[PDB]
Design goal:
part of a larger assembly; 4 chains; A mainly beta (about 150); B mainly alpha (about 55); C mainly beta (about 160); A: about 150 residues; mainly beta; globular; B: about 55 residues; mainly alpha; elongated; viral protein
Chain lengths: ~150, ~55, ~160, ~150
């Protein structure tokens, strides 16, 4: 479930090619990033890494936080997590994003929608377009290169 | 030429000349506008007048 | 008036660092990014801490308090000397205290900018706006509410 | 069909006046530009200069491109183009823009929308407002000052 688990080994791995080396769960941020992007951080509820997020409110004792969600409550896209501080890096929906996002368990040009758990699914209140086919990282974990450019 | 890009000195000279023309027009007429019709004027403060207004 | 006070005979009692920010003169936003886009436009009326609309008539177009489908941005600051207002475009998310229609707004409520540019509780919203606090009474008619405004909805 | 006039001028310009000297097709960029504006570039399919653009995908051998378009497929606005590299400068629809754009062959304050060819026409889902009347650069080419500030609800 973690993004960059710490696990030792007894053997070193060998790099054989310089292609398809970015299809890993540890690839944080966006593939194409602007120096004028607006980046926020929030306390993390659950594990919203590489998912669409919404604002969640408690009783009122603690500050508001973000959790995986979509639909009409979609606030932004979570692109990074700091585990030590529990801090989720969020790109607001008013700013366009290009990167690898979690896909529901799809071809370039297909229109995508954020479901109730923050995962991308085939169609649409949000502009999400797949730029590649689904890549399987785990039996349940699928990612896809998608471009998010606001609400439709 | 293909993209209309200048060295800094030349660009500065040209822009300064245009701005000085705007300043002379304001001093004579008391209005600021870039349209030959004189419309779409920039609203100014009171106690700011030219020789003509 | 953003800074209405001009003269006084005593100092106001402000010796507690907690709850000093909910004032009408606290311009800007609570959290601000260096890459926020800010424009200045001539204004008529008083659009401070309100949603604004463009008005075109001879003088260049100006901005004034308004909402609905004519919303163009939010006025977060003004300069009374030059009569120019600082506006955050609607394509840029904002977080801060804004004028509320009344004292009925509570936390987690979705909001709409009305004709006067005031936020009121909502199906009828063309923008995303969520109240983060309860409405506070600054004056007999002035209420402030902490709101995050983030983009526009897809449908009514 | 070109950012710069295709035919060379015959005279030395007598630039002594300063009013209405910007109503030209070579006026790239915007009239009011922020230093925080997000700017992208894409391969150009056709000539999408000063037109709304959409993402066009091929078979998959080569990367996606941008082509003139609008409606529900609008992605951004092409404000500039480099001819040597075929590179179109794009301002995303999530970033507001103010400048001269191609108009379909209209008074200030009229609501506008983008058509299938990426041209602005009088009215749906794009917030575009005209700030002036159409100017005629060529017998078939018209430009209008516009303010685009995102997508509209419904």
């Amino acid at each position: 479930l973690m993004k960059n688990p710490q696990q030792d080994s007894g053997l070193l791995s060998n790099s054989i090619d310089f292609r398809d080396q970015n299809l890993i769960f540890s690839n944080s941020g966006g593939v194409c990033t602007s120096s004028k992007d607006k980046i926020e951080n929030y306390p993390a509820k659950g594990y919203p890494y590489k998912r669409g997020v919404k604002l969640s409110f408690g009783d009122g004792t603690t500050e508001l936080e973000v959790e995986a969600g979509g639909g009409d409550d979609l606030y932004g896209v979570c692109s990074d997590i700091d585990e030590f501080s529990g801090m989720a890096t969020v790109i607001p929906i008013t700013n366009n994003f290009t990167g690898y996002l979690t896909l529901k368990k799809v071809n370039p040009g297909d229109k995508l929608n954020f479901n109730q758990h923050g995962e991308l699914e085939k169609v649409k209140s949000v502009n999400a377009i797949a730029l590649s086919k689904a890549h399987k990282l785990t039996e349940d974990l699928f990612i896809v290169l998608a471009s998010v450019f606001g609400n439709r | 030429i293909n993209n209309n890009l200048l060295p800094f000195a030349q660009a500065y000279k040209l822009a300064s000349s245009e701005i000085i023309k705007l300043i002379n027009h304001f001093v004579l007429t008391g209005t600021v506008s870039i349209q030959k019709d004189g419309k779409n004027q920039k609203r100014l403060l009171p106690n700011m007048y030219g020789l003509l207004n | 008036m953003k800074n209405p006070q001009h003269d006084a005979s005593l100092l106001s009692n402000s010796n507690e660092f907690r709850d000093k920010n909910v004032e009408f003169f606290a311009s800007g936003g609570t959290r601000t990014s260096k890459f926020d886009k800010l424009e200045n436009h001539p204004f008529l009326g008083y659009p401070y801490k309100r949603g604004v609309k463009r008005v075109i008539q001879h003088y260049e177009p100006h901005v004034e308090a308004g909402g609905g489908e004519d919303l163009y941005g939010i006025c977060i600051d003004i300069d009374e000397f030059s009569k120019t207002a600082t506006i955050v475009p609607i394509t840029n998310n904002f977080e801060g205290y804004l004028v509320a229609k009344d004292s009925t707004v509570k936390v987690k409520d979705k909001l709409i900018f009305n004709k006067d540019g005031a936020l009121e509780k909502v199906n009828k919203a063309t923008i995303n706006a969520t109240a983060l606090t309860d409405a506070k009474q600054i004056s007999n008619e002035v209420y402030l509410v902490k709101v995050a405004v983030f983009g526009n909805k897809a449908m009514s």
